[PDB]
Subunit: 369 residues, 4 copies
């Protein structure tokens, strides 16, 4: 009826019968073989956590938020959270790689829910219409204001998805700045005018959350080496799937880290990809800057001199505060930046990197600056 799972992020996650049935299905079990952070373990060696544990964590936090917000459709929203990652391919930024292969561009999460045993499991407790609702909610495609609130609980600025992965990524990578008082923040959330908002008692908790998110992006998600390994990985994965066909969902489901890593370790047609990823031959950071003009002028000089195939450019950006968070004050709604100098200080992260083939690095360095 209820089973407990140890999770070092929370203590224990209690899961009821519907979640357990889903957990034991083949598509959910597959997530144990998909690292949350892809190749990041090559930089942060303890980053071994998988999408399976993250999905359990999302279910847990979704439950907590639904409890705090007194949401009526609690069980349906918890399952939406649990199943949020079913269609995630192995690695980072590789949904954009898979989608253009299949003719429909149908989201893989929607497909795994509707085309596998997951669909049958859900029907035990829900109508097909409620299942369509859970698909909209989990994919962030609400059709009305009711679904919008429920979807925000998982995918919003305070969503259970983000709350779990920020803390889980911090815990495994070893980044103490990524922790925030999730418990206190959840307790200060309110529904107001069909929005999830923060009570003014939660203003420090909100600051801490936004700042923790800043640290995770600068330290881990935008780490210069994590990014170039991902660049090499995606170029490889583009080749591997180039003639693969996803009309059969089982060709998606057979995609896990090990499958891709094995093709890389064994086929000699991919030796170059293999070296760039696994033998420390990734292109080397020539420039990392917050100054777009400096980046652009260096990029231009390099491309005048070096062939394009020997360089890579990466422009990364993330709003730390997107201007759309309300704080419920004594005098009604206000925007968080009106009340917080810290939130008021927050600007988008903008980082520009140039990487070069290890053979040309010295030449590119001296003949360019």
């Amino acid at each position: 009826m209820i089973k407990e799972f140890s999770d070092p992020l929370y203590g224990f996650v209690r899961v009821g019968e519907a979640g357990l049935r889903l957990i034991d299905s083949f598509p959910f079990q597959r997530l144990r073989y998909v690292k949350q952070l892809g190749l990041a373990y090559l930089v942060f060696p303890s980053a071994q956590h998988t999408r399976f544990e993250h999905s359990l964590g999302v279910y847990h936090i979704t439950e907590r938020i639904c409890e705090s917000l007194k949401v009526k459709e609690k069980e349906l929203v918890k399952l939406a959270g649990l199943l949020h990652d079913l269609g995630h391919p192995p690695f980072s930024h590789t949904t954009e790689v898979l989608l253009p292969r299949e003719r429909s561009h149908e989201d893989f999460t929607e497909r795994v829910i509707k085309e596998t045993e997951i669909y049958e499991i859900l029907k035990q407790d829900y109508s097909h219409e409620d299942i369509e609702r859970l698909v909209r909610i989990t994919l962030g495609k609400p059709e009305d204001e009711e679904e919008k609130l429920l979807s925000e609980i998982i995918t919003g600025e305070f969503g259970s998805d983000r709350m779990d992965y920020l803390r889980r990524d911090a815990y495994f990578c070893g980044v103490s700045y990524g922790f925030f008082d999730y418990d206190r923040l959840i307790s200060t959330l309110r529904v107001y005018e069909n929005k999830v908002v923060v009570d003014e008692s939660g203003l420090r908790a909100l600051e801490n959350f936004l700042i923790s998110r800043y640290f995770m992006y600068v330290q881990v998600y935008f780490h210069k080496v994590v990014r170039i390994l991902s660049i090499h990985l995606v170029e490889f994965l583009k080749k591997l799937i180039s003639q693969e066909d996803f009309t059969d969902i089982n060709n998606f489901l057979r995609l896990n880290d090990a499958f891709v890593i094995s093709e890389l370790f064994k086929r000699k047609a991919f030796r170059e990809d293999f070296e760039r990823i696994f033998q420390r031959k990734h292109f080397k950071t020539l420039l990392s800057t917050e100054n777009y003009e400096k980046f652009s002028e260096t990029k231009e000089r390099l491309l005048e001199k070096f062939p394009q195939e020997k360089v890579r450019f990466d422009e990364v950006e993330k709003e730390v505060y997107g201007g759309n968070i309300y704080v419920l004050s004594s005098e009604g709604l206000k925007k968080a930046h009106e009340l917080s100098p810290l939130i008021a200080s927050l600007k988008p992260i903008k980082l520009y990197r140039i990487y070069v083939d290890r053979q040309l690095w010295e030449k590119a360095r001296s003949e360019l600056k």
Copy 2:
């Protein structure tokens, strides 16, 4: 010879023989009877830590920083850290009330070191000249470059004094928002051009340190009730020291928290002081705002209707980053804001408060809206 003291911040603090002799003296033991945060325990109940434990913590953090920086004169700077608080008067913001009531203005820390057994104790290990250098170092008044480096270790922006109190204040108040473990920050410190600077590998640790400091200010030091209690206390302390004579250092040494409180709890002349501070009859916050114009305008309308005696004003304007921290880059020494857009962007804290006698509070409220 070497004794260990339990300290929940650090595990144990190990102290050598010179430090123990100093710890055992009466002017150091006095610090056990002066709360680090004065009356803050009336708002944050667990803020019971004293200047005694803080001083042991400063000694321990000074040791650590000297170890990281490979400082020659380690023992002397450790002792300068240890004795840094000898001249502190009970509660907060009290130095400025005692100095005018003393003819020459001499710093009480220097007086306690020179006019009590502390001097004889230090003379066992240090020359007359090194004791004068210890005094300058501890007061932040160096006369040369060696003294300036050593003084920076204790009193600088991330000096051992601040590193200990920010962490200890958070630990005892219960402030779960900052990350307060500066082991990483300490490890990335360097001496360059005779300054304590941060290596670029410590940029994130420096960001975390400045954010943790912002949280302590907004949550604790500038808490609106903490501030009004201190306003009441300081008014009283001035009456109590109308014209006390500090020519005899023992009249300073007898000032501890219990002495001040007893003088209050007992005398019928000081009854309204007692009520405002200890019977929860402090002036009530009418306005707390970040807008100087709203403050100025409310102050005007208010002083039209009510007498000055029945109101108190408080202006807090505090820099979260002072523009004077160096980071050692591969390109040489930079200002921290030159390398961290986030630090470059941290805004100052600006808060304006108006407090009114609790009897007139409802009267003042509706008469202003």
Copy 3:
């Protein structure tokens, strides 16, 4: 209506209107001036926490346990927990000192509840009969099986009193072994046959709790120096109160740490007490042993040779597991030691100490072993 208090042990403690009224009374405020651990700060310098914060913590944990156990009289039990320490005198083991003074030997907690403004505050919400019930519950003097369950929630083996002070004492003294997963233990508690019992899912949590309790006793409560300072303190306090009269409860209420410490610091008739406690002249540990026979034979030799006034003996004992804890298993109640080798291993702590005047220590050492 609800006020939040920061407590580093829990985050925030939320207190309703009845608790707030009680908190702001003179007898509850007095507890801010009574250190939980008495003179232990002379050994563990950060042990500055007071009975005021402990009482708030007891209220908080009582609420949590009542919630987990679905107790009907939740509010009355929470207040019983909040008011549990009202009659605690300053220091350790000094209730046994005060009781024989007053003619009635009435418990001081009962007296403070019934003879001060506390009584009037409680009547706002409860009948005098319910107030008598709260007195029985808080003092562990239940009159029937209903009251017995409620009283166990506060004063039992898993009581909220113990759960708070073990963790609070660990947090402030700096003893990491004294922490246990209080949250998990509370969640596995059950009421069965009018007893608080532990579900079998909580068996590890129970082991951890009992072991944490072991560490606190060996490291802190029975620390050899903590004990001899308490021995000197109690002998002093016996003198101070010898002719004091407690028929007026205000003579109890004026007893706080500062009052006693001041009599000690200022009256020269007590110079010897003062030195033994505050000038490092406490009797020195000559023998500390688990072997009663070795203790007894050494005690006899010393008393043949030295006058009794120059030695002190201390026999300390504590059951770590008292054989009276039930675990609700699949096949009904069992005793914890049937299921746990760790609990099965636990024997009473038995420690025997001899202390001697610092003048006779060397003579006692050589002329005795």
Copy 4:
């Protein structure tokens, strides 16, 4: 020259050039593909940590212990710590299945060090003789007293190997019951009479270490489902290595977790193995008891009615304290139980389990009661 690796257990692990050259070799990188705890992640989902991170942690803890103990041959013992796992075969309890399938029985750790690039790498820094000493030290087979001391640092009861895995296993499994920070224990270690011993000031830290180890055994290593999964895995692994030839070391090196799992997930011969391990069809626990007689009697009645193939038995009998740890007292060297009644009293863990095919489980249950 010196590189830093994030490790959530320690902050960062700093490695010098000899260690980096070893870390970058293929036999060391293999360890990234072998989970520390085998199949435990099927019960404790976050148990994803690998032998790679564990080996870096052993290197780091070895460094720390050499620093505390002032060990001359620090670099050599650190490298012995680093390479300790080179010969580990994927999953748990697998050494004993590989050794009989290899003619001479030579330890695979020694083979990997001598028969791969590891040897050439070590020869850059160490003589032929020091490499033979490193091998003995790491295998716990010393030939003299220096080698024995160094080997104790890694493989002893509180060796760096155990200190790291107990803490790392707790951190990733989520075991909140022990205290697993052994900084204090390390600081109290001494070398006496050429043994690693504990100073009496570390008696409590030693008690905590042994209790923390008890918790890991009862909660994780002896978890009834963890044990049955390993029983199924080991039966399969034996079939897979019926007669594989390990004369070529590359046939050992190609054994990682994914290789074993692939061999299973794919071949139709191994289908019931696959189901028992990966499709939650493991034999179900019929009996778990501490009573050998109940075990023996249930085993008998059971084997009367059901065939051997449909049942599995497991006997676990593990010493929580082995009687062979020394504590340096003021009276000289003692056994730990001579000084700690609690350690003297810790009982062994004894657990007997009977598991049955999940089809026959209800049939076996009521036929036995």
